[model samples]
Target: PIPKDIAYHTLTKALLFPDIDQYQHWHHVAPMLAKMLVDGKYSIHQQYEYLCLFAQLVAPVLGPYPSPGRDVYRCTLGGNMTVELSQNFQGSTTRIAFEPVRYQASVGHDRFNRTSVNAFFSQLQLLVKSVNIELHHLLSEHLTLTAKDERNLNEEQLTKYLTNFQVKTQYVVALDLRKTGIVAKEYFFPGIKCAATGQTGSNACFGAIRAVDKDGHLDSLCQLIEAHFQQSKIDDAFLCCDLVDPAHTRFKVYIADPLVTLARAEEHWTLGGRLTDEDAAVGLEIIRGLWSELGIIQGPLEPSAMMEKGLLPIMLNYEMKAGQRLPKPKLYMPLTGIPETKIARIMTAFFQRHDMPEQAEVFMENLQAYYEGKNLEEATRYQAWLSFAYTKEKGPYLSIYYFWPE
Candidate 1:
């Protein structure tokens, strides 16, 4: 799996970039990503060439540990582009997409400026319209639908879904970027309450708007965001949306700095830092759930309560439909500040406890080449996060979120 993934990423690197020495991690399914774009037929060889303008800004850094380039997004995942690797059972796969940052309007082609983010939405609105035509052709010509579940969309439903597609000014055009040079094949059925999913590899990707865009959650979420960012230590805040089993929709944010962010959350909840006029109980409760996850016992003032050992820090997984409830929080233990012995011991015990010896062995073996032969050194080579499932009673599900080549 590692070798195949390595080759896939290499092919993708070649297909996407020339310099290859950029500051980005192998957090992608490059071939898969390329194909999705091609299938969609975005006619954006020009648009993509235009998008390449911020490759340097958004890409990863290639260097030894403790390098500055790794801080490009200030130690947070870029909301602009992201590649997700999911490991379920014996298999692992990747999902890639990009949300072009509107603030950075003058990347390389400043010619496309003098406008609000609405223009980006307009361009995206057009793409969504055009891509429907492309999807129809493929449906009528080269494909068949095979529904995996009752929730999945039929061809007609998909067409209707696409036709009903709308992008507001508040929304950003997030393309499910794929390998297709001028086009893409895959679609992101994320967002809304629960996106109406497509059948196996069908171009008919339909769903409602993202969960964050629902009701007053976003406006209130932004209030917390406004207060959270005012702290200055808050490096970046990225909105996250993904497809999952059972086809559910949830909201998430990946924030930088473990202690600082949590403390800010604590402050926002407790002290007078609250920003919104209306009751932000829902949003505020979301923070409290996150606080509960990290075992926030002694209050926020003493937020230096770093967990075991790890890096890449924090993630806030929230449910919007449920309204007043706790969020699913995934916070990483900071391994960057510790030594290798405890790290190894923790991993050894974790794998043993979870009966994941095979997974653990392969995981370690795959990471060995990144650094010297020292097994524990792999933890330091990349910004890997070691986060646990909140419901450890369900057998302690843990994630070793390590990106390749920094």
Candidate 2:
């Protein structure tokens, strides 16, 4: 895992100022917001609404800030808009309380990453229209259908449709706290922190889930944690072997903190202080401890299995390199490769624990299909499985992915 200190700064740069100014100031903050909106794990609706709200807030003050040399929105010399806002307001208030022009300017942008924020605003307007149309049709159809076949539709069916209504018509609202220094304890799904509390806890606590502990009991919370932990373990190890290692096995474990702005916002909003490098370091330590606690223990391991001791600290420095990319691995002659049969054996054993014999069979079948006439992608698309017969008892699963970089 990448340490928070390194990853967070890099993210802050990418998010707040993609193009550096001649005097080293941020000429444009649009790039940072653009990247956050595009890459952050936000739903489309949430992305649109939040970005709009942001534009409405910052454009007034930052609009007159020096633009370096290029258009004001293209270079990197602008004042730290988020920092400015936080200091101006003492990190209080939500987007609704801000003036409309300020809100629109904060969310909208000139260029650099994609379509201008103005375009998104226009798109948002169209989306509202589209939603209204869909809602009208939905209400009319459901009401008419219910009156005709109330008995056949049944209460269960009606309940399902009613639930679906929320799902289909939901609109997300987001507030990019990094800019406003008002990290939300909850905003929308992707808005991890709440603008009010700035607490970095569970998404559910931030209101991602409609209910907390359905029964609101210890048992429910414990069960939820257990399920998540078990799945997390499996996913972390699997992804490490399958993706991260293959990509950068030679480099030190790289930690990228993508939450600098978020953390700063959090600190300002909740602590009445700015988030400094020291705070980032503390956050990194906490992250390291989390990884240590959640490290996989149930996997089948080789007798010669090796684990790095200073892996976490090493990742912190590794990300400080000029470019955000990892270092290239050294080339060794006569590359030693794991035997294909051994890989197959390991996979067969792994999936069997999940009771997926048919999946194993399908792998062989896919090879044959590829040899015959089908393309590799198409041939390997389908798999078959037996439900009860091949299944094994559930085991504790832990997911490493939740351990976000920074």
Candidate 3:
């Protein structure tokens, strides 16, 4: 549970942004509040006291009445309000409202009910917009470069065009604390941790290239990725089984800076390794970044580590096979030679929960909205809401029967 003071400060700043229009504010606030609820901060009745107060404060700006209520709240709304205002009613014995039975009853109908649908969708739409805007804003603010020109040929380019550059490279390095076990565990988790000596050997490879190589060079992406995997004693090329093609290229190409993708993945993995499911889905973004920066393309090819029927690959296939499975596994640990710990299990659960069907659906919907030309703020907020809900549910692998299909 977040401390009251922390929650108050963070949420106040988040929910009380005056610069945004009222409608826009709701877009952000709805998702933020929903996320808090999803994250289990409002688990008990007493915990909701502050939330209710906060909701009331923003109610006037929100609209004529409090917006759509979760089924738990709908049935109880009138009565809850009635009881709260009654002088004769004692607070001690009153039952706080929960999901309303009336709303639940209407959910099974064949024809879409616009009224109920609107309630949920409206909130979601706003949230999606908020997230998209926030993400774009962050990116714009952080990535300051406006334009890069590659059209002009210079002396450097002439040198590269005229001669082949050769350089001596070493494939070995001394094992160290910073580059080995500690960093791996702190970022990738103990399941994937390799010893310092082992990792240094695993990552061995050296490359020397002409200075004229563009960041998006397709060949480089594959070669670097292959080398990295090879260092780990895994071969990524096996994913491309067919050798030749006529109409279409056997390997589609995309380019990006390896360092950027690697750095982003590290940040994401450190945050429980769950990708944000929004217009810019973190997984897709990773691929996009890889393509643009490193010039790599993803296709039907299986992941590099899967060729040998390895346990991790097997698990991945099993999880993906059950497409509807919530809390799908994206990355895997060998689950071998690990000393069991409470914290480790908790972290594992966090990543697993993001793979839920509800989450997948929400993410996919937002992504579709994004590709269809919806604004960035809308897309990103929706993604953040899903992220919040995933965490609130204590990871995605909880009871499937309890999930509500969107």
Candidate 4:
């Protein structure tokens, strides 16, 4: 049904086009190439050419997708395309060469063989690292700091403002193979750090599967990083490092003014709302239940202290939809410090007490497993729920909160 000329033109635009301004057009073309490659229509050489073109277009802007903090433009050839293989498929196997290194692959059928698919991903990974190096170098040269911007300060101010400061940012990585040619998404995190203490807001770390060449692996990395980013409440960290360089992306926390004594707002320091008598009773019950089961004793069960440790009832003022009111309030707690096995049991008990849905039970099990270090893939799936329950602004629900401590 498709015309060969049209396909050739689309491939040409994506691979051979030189104008940087024409980048927008490649968005559609990239996916088309992916479909064609997956469909197994083009020859090995044709696919190789297309892959090289994809890499050429992707390499320059690979540092940051959407945009970095400030506007950055460069007028240099992005990536060098080198395809090396001896004649008659002799000597060495087919390899795609670029900045960081060369990858081994083969293009025999219309689509890439398993080796070729892996080679394509390997190229992407190396490209990410290379582009990061370039971005870091560029940022270091252009980004200048003034005395006022980097003022000297004491530990207290740095700890209060700079340490664990959260920021909104985007992350984009290459190769989703099936859908878009590349995977790109916006994420938030406390990626900034205090220079003096080298202390960051939280130890929210993530890694992608280096072996499997699938988009799902990259997607998981993005989700975990985003969740980790949102969990931090500190918001005054400076954007010191290169925003695009995934390898060394960091924000620096520092006191802007020596005289200024920063103070958190009342809302930041206090719980969402004053708990009603019944709400307090329910919360105390949950806390007592957890404490009794965990054998944690010798502390005053004051509402303020407990709330500080993430023990609170999320108030959900639901509007009556039908003739019935919502059953019982939900109590929230964190998984920090609790034994993995105990966490599962306590979470199961909480779910049963609240008569949560089947989906909620699954979520509780996943969260418990994440803490217990059972299955990262399963744990990563519940990042949204974890973010909602554990972030600084707990969602509108009755539940205990726990953020993994930095």
Cα lDDT tens digits, model 4, 1-406, are: 5532354445556564444433443542344343344233445455555555555744333221212242221111111111111100101111111111111111112111112222334444564443333332332211222233235535675444332121212111223222213231111122321232234322222221111113332443333323423442332222222223353333221111111111111111111222233443444444455545644322224545643543322121111111222212222222333444454555456556555444235544434432443543333112111101111232123322222212
The TM-scores, one per candidate, come to 0.40, 0.20, 0.19, 0.25
Global lDDT for candidate 1?
0.34
List runs of model 1 lying over 4 Å from the truth. Answer: 1-238, 243-248, 253-316, 319-325, 339-344, 369-383, 392-394, 403-406
- Write candidate 1's Cα lDDT for 1-406 as tens digits: 5432233444445545534334334333233333222322334362244234224322332111223433221112221123332122122222223322332222323112123323433444344343322222222111222233324645775443332122211112223333342222222222221233322211121111222243544444444444444553443343434322212434444444454355554443332353332233343554454334433322122223443332234433322233533334444443343334444455555465557666455444443433334556433524244454433234444544334333
Q: List the candidate 2 regions with Cα displacement exceeding 4 Å.
A: 1-197, 203-345, 351-357, 364-406
Q: State candidate 3's TM-score.
A: 0.19
What does the lDDT come to for candidate 4?
Answer: 0.30
Question: Candidate 4 — which residues are off by over 4 angstroms?
Answer: 1-149, 152-285, 291-334, 357-406
The per-prediction tally of clashing pairs is 32, 57, 40, 14
Computed on alpha carbons, the lDDT of every model, listed in order, comes to 0.34, 0.25, 0.24, 0.30
- Candidate 2, residue 261: how far the Cα is off, in Å: 28
Q: Root-mean-square deviation of each candidate, in angstroms?
A: 16.5, 24.6, 24.0, 20.5
Q: What would the per-residue lDDT of candidate 2 be over residues 194-270, giving only the tens digit for each residue?
A: 21123222322212211322332333322333243243231110000101111121111112122223232222221
Candidate 3 local lDDT, residue 332: 18
Best by TM-score: 1
User: Considering summed lDDT, which 10 consecutive residues are worst modelled in model 2?
Assistant: 234-243
Model 3 residue runs over 4 Å out of place are 1-25, 28-38, 42-406
